[PDB]
Design a protein around this nucleic acid. Structure first.
Length: 46
DNA sequence: TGTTTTTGACAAGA
DNA sequence: ATCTTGTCAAAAAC
């Protein structure tokens, strides 16, 4: 029912970004999504 | 006015 | 202060 916070384009865009050392705190705000959401798609075990 | 799928705030971390 | 993770009421969508 409810749509996903981030599709795939940005799902990997983002993913690729974290690898370059970006702060979830910031990514979350740009992309207008909750931080919990991010730690969910990409755990600190990634 | 009801279910479902995913979010986001929050609490809590031998 | 940070940084993580899992729980849970409910927003979003039909």
């Amino acid at each position: 029912g409810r749509p996903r916070a981030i599709n795939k384009h940005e799902q990997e865009q983002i993913s690729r970004l974290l690898e370059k050392g970006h702060p979830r705190q910031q990514l979350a705000i740009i992309f207008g999504i909750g931080v919990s959401t991010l730690y969910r798609y990409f755990p600190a075990s990634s």
